[PDB]
Amino acid sequence: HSIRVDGDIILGGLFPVHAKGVPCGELKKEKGIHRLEAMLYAIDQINKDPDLLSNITLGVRILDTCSRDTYALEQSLTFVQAL
Amino acid sequence: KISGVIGAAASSVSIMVANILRLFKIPQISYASTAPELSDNTRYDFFSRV
Amino acid sequence: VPPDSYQAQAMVDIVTALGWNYVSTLASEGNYGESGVEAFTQISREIGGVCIAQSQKIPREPRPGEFEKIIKRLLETPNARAVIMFANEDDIRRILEAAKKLNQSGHFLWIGSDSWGSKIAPVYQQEEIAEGAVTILPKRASIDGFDRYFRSRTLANNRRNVWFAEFWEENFGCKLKKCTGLERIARDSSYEQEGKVQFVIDAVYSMAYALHNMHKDLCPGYIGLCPRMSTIDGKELLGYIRAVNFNGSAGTPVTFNENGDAPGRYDIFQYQITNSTEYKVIGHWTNQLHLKVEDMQWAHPASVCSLP
Numbered sequence: 001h002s003i004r005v006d007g008d009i010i011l012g013g014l015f016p017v018h019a020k021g022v023p024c025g026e027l028k029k030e031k032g033i034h035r036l037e038a039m040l041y042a043i044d045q046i047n048k049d050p051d052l053l054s055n056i057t058l059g060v061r062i063l064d065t066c067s068r069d070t071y072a073l074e075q076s077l078t079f080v081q082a083l
Numbered sequence: 084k085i086s087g088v089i090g091a092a093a094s095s096v097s098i099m100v101a102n103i104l105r106l107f108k109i110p111q112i113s114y115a116s117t118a119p120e121l122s123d124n125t126r127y128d129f130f131s132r133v
Numbered sequence: 134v135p136p137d138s139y140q141a142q143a144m145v146d147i148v149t150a151l152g153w154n155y156v157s158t159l160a161s162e163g164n165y166g167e168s169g170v171e172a173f174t175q176i177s178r179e180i181g182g183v184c185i186a187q188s189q190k191i192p193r194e195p196r197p198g199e200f201e202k203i204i205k206r207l208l209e210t211p212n213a214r215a216v217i218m219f220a221n222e223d224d225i226r227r228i229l230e231a232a233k234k235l236n237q238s239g240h241f242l243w244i245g246s247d248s249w250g251s252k253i254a255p256v257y258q259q260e261e262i263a264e265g266a267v268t269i270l271p272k273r274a275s276i277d278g279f280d281r282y283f284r285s286r287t288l289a290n291n292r293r294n295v296w297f298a299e300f301w302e303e304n305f306g307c308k309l310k311k312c313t314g315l316e317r318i319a320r321d322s323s324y325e326q327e328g329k330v331q332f333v334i335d336a337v338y339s340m341a342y343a344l345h346n347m348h349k350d351l352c353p354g355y356i357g358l359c360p361r362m363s364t365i366d367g368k369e370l371l372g373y374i375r376a377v378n379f380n381g382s383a384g385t386p387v388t389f390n391e392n393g394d395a396p397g398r399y400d401i402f403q404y405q406i407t408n409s410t411e412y413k414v415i416g417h418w419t420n421q422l423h424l425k426v427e428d429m430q431w432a433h434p435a436s437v438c439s440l441p
């Protein structure tokens with residue numbers, strides 16, 4: 001229920017994979033899947049691309065918003081759990 | 084461990100605090116906040132006012 | 134993406150270019166619609182020359198009979214034929230179908246925001262009631278590399294995506310009738326790349342350069358993560374984020390101003406119905422309106438409060 005890719009510098013993402021329900025509802029094929037796949041593609045390009053962030057790996061921490069404010073607040077909390 | 088909060092005064096402050104107290108399930112009672120949008124049980128469920 | 138103040142300014146410019154001065158607004162509950170309509174009202178008053186008849190608000194939870202009531206209040210002023218909308222797709226579709234039920238075809242002249250855009254769903258099976266609508270969208274282009282990447286994905290190779298199984302189940306209408314899982318995307322099912330994909334990739338690259346430049350300054354000649362760059366300070370990284378300049382995936386430049394905003398650049402579409410139906414580009418906005426009137430096709434109608 002959360003996408004991990006490890007790396008030296010870690011970025012976070014928030015995308016509406018599911019619709020607003022029940023907290024969550026139906027899958028969004030276009031607004032949710034295409035966009036997170038695009039972020040993963042961009043990360044892969046940067047990592048494979050030389051002379052841009054050379055010898056430094058980018059990872060990802062991708063979460064779901066479910067098109068709601070409170071759910072995104074909880075996911076932001078898991079972003080900031082380190083402090 | 085906090086079991087209940089005597090709320091804030093301004094409505095905006097109460098809204099901001101309630102968004103988190105909802106997540107951690109802590110009752111809130113306010114003494115001065117009168118915004119009509121705090122009567123919605125779906126979004127502000129642990130909020131009460133005197 | 135640019136803020137909605139520029140979109141409101143473009144809408145005012147379109148209205149004043151079309152010779153209209155009597156309009157009614159329509160907004161959905163929330164930050165987006167209300168803020169957009171408020172910006173439109175403030176700009177239109179300050180400039181002058183455009184008068185607003187009514188302002189209506191669509192509730193978040195629509196009670197029965199809401200859309201008919203909204204249409205009937207709009208018809209209380211019959212010289213206000215232009216409606217400026219900041220509304221979601223479902224609200225737009227329901228408003229259009231309520232207009233069709235009350236038989237008001239041709240009365241209203243729609244001007245919608247990026248929530249309308251180029252979407253088939255609001256106008257599907259309701260072409261006549263939504264013919265001639267003018268919409269706005271930030272400029273964008275399709276990316277071929279992402280298309281190759283998405284068409285090459287399978288269940289075996291794409292395992293880092295936790296939700297990919299559900300997408301596979303829904304896309305092909307199968308259960309993992311049953312399916313063997315050997316289906317290929319864009320061959321056995323319809324496919325078209327989403328609109329904001331570019332804006333996602335650009336965003337990622339905005340980090341990628343902003344970090345990189347930092348490592349070129351705070352880490353002179355040291356390869357890899359630095360002892361001082363281990364603690365990446367957010368406040369310092371903000372300046373590097375806001376002072377970037379590079380070419381994006383489409384090839385257009387990417388810049389931020391002092392407030393972290395992209396410059397306003399828009400395309401204008403009109404829904405036209407010929408003997409197929411499409412959204413046709415009729416102009417653009419790059420801090421000054423560039424609109425073609427020779428290529429506009431309505432069922433031009435005027436929205437004026439009284440004739441001279």
Ligand SMILES: N[C@H](C(=O)O)c1ccc(C(=O)O)c(C(=O)O)c1
Binds near residue numbers: 093115117
């Ligand atoms: N009910 C309103 C509100 O909802 O904000 C309110 C709340 C608190 C105060 C206060 O600080 O004493 C006041 C006031 O200025 O008298 C007004």
